[PDB]
Amino acid sequence: DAVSLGLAGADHPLLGAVVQLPQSDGLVFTSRLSLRSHPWLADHAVRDVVIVPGTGLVELAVRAGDEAGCPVLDELVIEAPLVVPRRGGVRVQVALGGPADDGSRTVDVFSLREDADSWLRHATGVLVPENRPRGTAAFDFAAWPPPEAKPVDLTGAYDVLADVGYGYGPTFRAVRAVWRRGSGNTTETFAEIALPEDARAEAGRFGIHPALLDAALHSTMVSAAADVRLPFAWNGLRLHAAGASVLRVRVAKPERDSLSLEAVDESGGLVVTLDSLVGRP
Amino acid sequence: DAVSLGLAGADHPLLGAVVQLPQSDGLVFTSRLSLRSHPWLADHAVRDVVIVPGTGLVELAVRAGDEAGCPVLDELVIEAPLVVPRRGGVRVQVALGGPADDGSRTVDVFSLREDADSWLRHATGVLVPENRPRGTAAFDFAAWPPPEAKPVDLTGAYDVLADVGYGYGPTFRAVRAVWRRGSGNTTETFAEIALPEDARAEAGRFGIHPALLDAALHSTMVSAALPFAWNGLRLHAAGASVLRVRVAKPERDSLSLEAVDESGGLVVTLDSLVGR
């Protein structure tokens, strides 16, 4: 019970408690993750090591920002994998700094393994207030699949990814269809993403289920696998509608090493936009 | 429970949890106080309002320091009283800053009532590492009561103060005997302080029970029948339940304290508590 200890409950599937820090006008979220308390984390493992996806860190950051009325993820840099131990727990912390004059806050994500004597930083970034909302998706998701987009046969793809090193279990195998359009840096990837029924109830409690956001982006790899790197730098991430479980997505390339994302729900309402994601080996 | 949520248990009767803050090398202790959870708190009330004693805030500050290797309270300035609701809880926070080159750390005590939208600060101060050898009492407590000190009949004294608006309940009525030496600004107050039966058993849970320290200092009020800045408090021994005490006045508006246990061992020294 968070409240009997003098904190508030985070009401969130990955986070335990939040407490304000009146001294700095900041706040801090606390959590303990394990494979026994969060079994579905086992469904994202890179070379058989369970690591919290980049998208899980994004969700944590945006949940913290939203607590303080700074829902926009201006920037997030992923420093070091948040390894979940195959037995035991790891203590997690999301730290939100006090507001600057523009109202922007720093956000950092830390972890402390049961064995450890020092915390490890996993991500550091900046959340900003929403000065001006978006309204509707820019891309025409109503004309679907998009004209002249060629469907990709997905048969075998998630196996070919596992071989290369990407171990997506059932929770993350959410790419239902992929179409492709264009060739070079003008490549567009379109996909339908739907979480398996096992993840559905959880999905509703997230801002966006990290597996839904991960699949939205890893559709590009699934696309390629039918003919390792991790997310490095996130820029301009906004969550527009909470708790989705099924998406239509367009993924494109602003530069040769980067992705942008727009995703809508089946009613055509915006769910997530991402200005830029840069990756690294 | 705390570990479940990503914190550590505080193992202190007035604190719930503690967590490090790697963003700042600080740490934060969290708590919820209520008269249901902490019934003895009701025994410290001013004009019918339950206030966490100033000594309570000292006890939390030093416990927070202990956590970080900064056990000595260089300074604590009390700002707004920490009111305990008659029903439902009040959220308390003790915030400890990162270390200076000193090793010294800031300490701040806040609270949040059940629907306020803002925190109130109650106390702010500085903790420092223990850089001095184990303490020796300056005063000869073994010659007791002191030469030329006069006994003070305490009959009805607590009741006097209760009409003035100091509601000391059973837990806080711990002054047992008082001797007085001198008068006005030069007076030394010598007292035997003992927690009552029920708080006495629990005293081992505290650094020093806030009622015991409160009574150590309010022996002056009892003898005569909410302070501001603490300076230079060292807790030499933990878990005391009975004291011999000398309270003196460094300045006409302040008190100083030395206290020893029944065996003569130093328990707590306090350079000054100032009123203003």
Helix/strand/coil (H/E/C) assignment for every residue in B211-266: HHHHHHHHHHHHHHCCCCEEEEEEECCCCECEEEEEEECCCCCEEEEEEECCCCCE
Structure tokens at B160: 């006097």
Task: Clarify whether B163 is annotated catalytic.
Answer: no
What is the rounded distance in angstroms from the CA atom of residue B242 to the CA atom of residue A163? 71
Structure tokens at A67: 């607590």
Q: In Å, what resolution does this model reach?
A: 1.8
| Cα radius of gyration (chain B) | 18
The set of catalytic residues of A is 44, 214
Closest CA to B176 of B162, B198, B195: B195
Asked whether the CA dihedral B264, B269, B272, B274 is positive or negative, the reply is negative
If one counts every other C-beta atom within 10 angstroms of the C-beta of residue B88, the result is 12
Domains, chain B: 1-276 (3.10.129.110)
Structure tokens at A65: 């920002």
Method for structure elucidation? X-ray
| Cα radius of gyration (chain A) | 18
If one counts every other C-beta atom within 10 angstroms of the C-beta of residue A19, the result is 24
Task: Clarify whether B214 is annotated catalytic.
Answer: yes
Structure tokens at A214: 């991960």
Closest CA to A8 of B30, B165, B147: B30
What is the rounded distance in angstroms from the CA atom of residue A164 to the CA atom of residue A235? 27
In chain B, residues 145-174 whose CB comes closer than 8 Å to chain A: none
A/B interface, count of CB pairs below 8 Å: 95
Is the Cβ–Cβ distance between A218 and A225 less than 8 Å? no
Closest CA to A275 of A261, A255, A265, A263: A261
Find which of A11, A20, A23, A118 to mutate to test the B interface (most B CBs within 10 Å of its CB). Answer: A23
Q: Which residue among B6, B16, B119 sits closest to A30, beta carbon to beta carbon?
A: B6
What is the rounded distance in angstroms from the CA atom of residue B103 to the CA atom of residue B135? 21
What is the rounded distance in angstroms from the CA atom of residue A173 to the CA atom of residue A194? 9
Query: Position of tokens 């597996």?
Result: A211
Q: Which residues of A touch B79 (CB under 8 A)?
A: none
In chain B, residues 55-114 whose CB comes closer than 8 Å to chain A: 89, 91-93, 95, 97, 106, 108, 110, 112
Q: Which residues of A touch B95 (CB under 8 A)?
A: 21-23
CA–centroid distance for A215 within its chain? 9
Which residues touch B202 (CB under 8 Å, ≥6 apart)?
A: B13, B209
SS3 for B33-67 is ECCCCCHHHHHEEECCEEECCHHHHHHHHHHHHHH
